[PDB]
Amino acid sequence: PEHDERKRLGLKTVIILSSLYLLSIWVKKFKWAGIKTRKFVFNPPKPRK
Amino acid sequence: AEVTQLSNGIVVATEHNPSAHTASVGVVFGSGAANENPYNNGVSNLWKNIFLSKENSAVAAKEGLALSSNISRDFQSYIVSSLPGSTDKSLDFLNQSFIQQKANLLSSSNFEATKKSVLKQVQDFEENDHPNRVLEHLHSTAFQNTPLSLPTRGTLESLENLVVADLESFANNHFLNSNAVVVGTGNIKHEDLVNSIESKNLSLQTGTKPVLKKKAAFLGSEVRLRDDTLPKAWISLAVEGEPVNSPNYFVAKLAAQIFGSYNAFEPASRLQGIKLLDNIQEYQLCDNFNHFSLSYKDSGLWGFSTATRNVTMIDDLIHFTLKQWNRLTISVTDTEVERAKSLLKLQLGQLYESGNPVNDANLLGAEVLIKGSKLSLGEAFKKIDAITVKDVKAWAGKRLWDQDIAIAGTGQIEGLLDYMRIRSDMSMMRW
């Protein structure tokens, strides 16, 4: 007997949860942009030591 | 200070002082390390040591003359000192090494002896002077790919490719009459300097300096030079500041005087009226710090440098300092602005009124090249006295609140965190 009400609350939940999923992919790629393009150079030290 | 342009286009500036026992005459040019490219970086440092070479200094020492030189990012200077009454002898020496005869200093025996001396100085600077090479790496990461990122001494890789034809090419483009100011400080008066210059007729050709393509721009970035065999950690951090001829030139200088300098081993520097010292003295987070405000022709830097041996609490020293910078936007008080007014007038009163005519000749000539005149010390004191708390909050909300930073560090800097946790301390999350 809940069948008509269950399918209407499921329409509100899926729209909100799929918008939060797409917004969190954007925010994660912004905060990780400094780590992903980091560069490293190696000059071997002189054998004084 | 009296400025006068002559009939052939030479600008003469003089600051007479009758209670001095020396006099200084020199030439200041308006091109520095920011007028080079990455291939000839270091030709200004080589021209300085050619002027101060042994065969040049021996000719001046027989007349009772001393030589000085200074290379900066916007200017260069070549200054001769003497007794007050030998000032025409120091003009004849300066004539015979910049105007009438310059090919005897660039001989092959003198050039190769000078080049190996400069190569030893830059190599010693890169392995031993850690607070000064971190501040040079801060300029190269904040203004990268722009003329304001080249070091003033040159690099070790660029200096070994320079020949005698590179120095003649730089002199032909930059040592011109329209780029120069003739200065004089100490016991020398303005009319005897002008009449002595006008007695030698001085043809002095009419070239013009080459103009740069790129304008200086700030970029938020970082560079880390980790070295675990060193005993300390040296860190510099800055935002974009004010240029020369800015309306907020003195407001940025007063904001750096609020936080000031510190030495942990001096007993009187631990008693200063700075609220940052309550946080850092409980666990002894650092050895020393100092706040600066550097200004150039195009842009500037505002920040602090530090050195510490507490290598496991580096993240508390950066967090406590940046939380005090937040208070300039929201909750700076009235006693902190009145204290920084008095200490700023004492600081630049000791800069512009030392007893050294070589220091005064560098400050005078660098200012006439940019503005055409020099601001008096009495008029600078009235500008500082008219700064309010609302002027500080308006400047800091534009320059400091939620802005990009540039970081540089060397030594045991493992405890220094990422960029994004230092960048997020530039706002408070409260407001």
Side-chain angles (χ1 to χ4, degrees):
Chain A
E2 85 277 345
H3 167 273
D4 287 359
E5 179 76 16
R6 165 167 56 82
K7 282 182 169 188
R8 204 200 91 248
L9 294 186
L11 191 63
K12 308 176 64 188
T13 313
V14 164
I15 289 173
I16 292 178
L17 277 175
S18 52
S19 294
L20 277 171
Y21 175 58
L22 291 178
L23 285 160
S24 71
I25 295 174
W26 198 97
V27 168
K28 189 252 158 187
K29 285 172 171 289
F30 179 79
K31 299 193 170 305
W32 273 78
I35 304 293
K36 290 256 172 169
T37 52
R38 198 166 47 162
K39 275 154 178 43
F40 288 96
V41 184
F42 182 56
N43 298 99
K46 298 295 183 182
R48 305 285 187 181
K49 303 314 290 147
Chain B
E2 299 182 358
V3 190
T4 288
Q5 187 158 354
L6 293 190
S7 66
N8 53 5
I10 317 175
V11 188
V12 181
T14 306
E15 265 190 335
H16 177 242
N17 183 16
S19 70
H21 301 112
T22 47
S24 294
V25 181
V27 176
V28 185
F29 291 107
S31 315
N35 287 267
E36 307 162 344
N37 53 72
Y39 288 96
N40 67 340
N41 182 31
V43 291
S44 296
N45 202 28
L46 267 178
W47 261 119
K48 157 175 167 171
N49 290 277
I50 282 292
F51 183 67
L52 303 180
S53 57
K54 201 205 177 191
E55 290 179 352
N56 212 30
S57 298
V59 175
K62 293 190 190 68
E63 306 292 325
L65 270 47
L67 311 184
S68 281
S69 187
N70 181 57
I71 307 299
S72 181
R73 281 178 201 270
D74 281 325
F75 63 97
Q76 308 154 13
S77 52
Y78 301 92
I79 299 157
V80 192
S81 298
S82 67
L83 281 185
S86 297
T87 6
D88 42 356
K89 258 186 280 197
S90 64
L91 270 176
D92 287 329
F93 181 78
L94 200 62
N95 190 19
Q96 295 299 110
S97 67
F98 279 111
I99 291 95
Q100 292 224 330
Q101 181 193 337
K102 292 178 70 175
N104 296 25
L105 287 170
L106 292 178
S107 78
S108 67
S109 165
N110 191 50
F111 182 77
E112 301 274 355
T114 301
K115 187 183 166 192
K116 68 184 293 294
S117 298
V118 181
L119 273 174
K120 203 183 152 32
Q121 296 166 16
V122 182
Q123 193 166 18
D124 184 42
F125 171 78
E126 207 52 50
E127 316 176 329
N128 281 110
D129 197 359
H130 302 128
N132 271 346
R133 66 188 285 263
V134 165
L135 195 69
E136 277 270 354
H137 274 99
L138 183 75
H139 283 81
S140 73
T141 199
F143 298 116
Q144 73 193 17
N145 305 125
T146 256
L148 212 54
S149 58
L150 303 165
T152 60
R153 289 164 188 86
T155 61
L156 206 68
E157 283 80 14
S158 191
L159 277 160
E160 307 175 319
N161 296 329
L162 291 174
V163 298
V164 68
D166 289 316
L167 268 77
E168 292 164 323
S169 178
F170 185 80
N172 282 359
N173 291 135
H174 298 273
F175 291 169
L176 309 169
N177 181 39
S178 64
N179 207 27
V181 168
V182 171
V183 294
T185 51
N187 194 2
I188 173 69
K189 62 181 72 172
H190 186 90
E191 287 84 5
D192 295 55
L193 186 52
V194 162
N195 292 338
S196 299
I197 290 173
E198 279 186 330
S199 177
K200 301 181 287 291
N201 283 358
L202 263 63
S203 66
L204 264 294
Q205 54 182 50
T206 322
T208 290
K209 206 220 296 195
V211 69
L212 289 157
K213 300 295 188 291
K214 187 66 66 67
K215 188 64 69 178
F218 187 85
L219 192 70
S221 49
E222 63 171 5
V223 54
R224 300 174 184 248
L225 286 302
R226 192 166 155 180
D227 199 330
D228 277 351
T229 74
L230 290 184
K232 298 191 197 169
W234 293 268
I235 297 155
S236 292
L237 194 151
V239 297
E240 182 185 5
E242 312 293 327
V244 190
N245 282 138
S246 188
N248 290 138
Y249 177 78
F250 282 115
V251 191
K253 266 176 159 34
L254 188 143
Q257 195 62 241
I258 288 175
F259 307 108
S261 289
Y262 177 60
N263 193 354
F265 301 105
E266 291 289 328
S269 69
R270 305 172 64 91
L271 304 169
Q272 303 180 273
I274 301 158
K275 295 185 187 299
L276 184 53
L277 293 187
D278 292 329
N279 293 122
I280 79 175
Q281 275 176 357
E282 179 184 359
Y283 280 93
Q284 211 43 72
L285 296 178
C286 71
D287 272 5
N288 55 78
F289 63 82
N290 70 285
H291 287 252
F292 50 87
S293 196
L294 308 171
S295 307
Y296 305 106
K297 200 165 169 56
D298 284 350
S299 182
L301 289 178
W302 193 97
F304 84 115
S305 309
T306 192
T308 179
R309 294 182 319 248
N310 203 344
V311 297
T312 48
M313 294 176 87
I314 298 182
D315 67 308
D316 290 281
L317 169 72
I318 309 295
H319 174 74
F320 276 139
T321 310
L322 260 49
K323 283 291 151 265
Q324 288 286 137
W325 294 1
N326 284 163
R327 295 179 58 247
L328 290 189
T329 318
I330 43 165
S331 67
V332 60
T333 78
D334 215 328
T335 309
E336 303 186 276
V337 181
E338 296 307 306
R339 178 201 167 262
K341 274 185 194 182
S342 282
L343 287 180
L344 181 65
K345 287 191 279 180
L346 180 70
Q347 172 212 315
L348 55 91
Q350 294 180 284
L351 187 80
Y352 285 103
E353 277 156 352
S354 55
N356 205 10
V358 186
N359 284 160
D360 299 328
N362 278 101
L363 292 164
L364 167 75
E367 201 156 344
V368 184
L369 283 163
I370 284 183
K371 307 174 180 183
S373 64
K374 203 195 183 184
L375 183 72
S376 179
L377 202 63
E379 290 163 10
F381 274 18
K382 296 181 187 179
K383 285 177 190 305
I384 296 170
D385 280 339
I387 295 172
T388 65
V389 187
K390 286 174 69 176
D391 292 1
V392 179
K393 283 181 174 174
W395 175 86
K398 169 204 191 303
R399 285 295 189 192
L400 277 168
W401 188 266
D402 203 44
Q403 299 280 346
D404 262 353
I405 55 186
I407 322 170
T410 202
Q412 296 188 51
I413 47 155
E414 192 193 23
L416 181 72
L417 294 182
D418 289 345
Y419 186 87
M420 276 308 264
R421 271 192 75 166
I422 307 171
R423 172 61 173 81
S424 84
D425 268 353
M426 300 302 289
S427 45
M428 208 177 250
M429 182 87 175
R430 259 80 241 173
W431 266 249

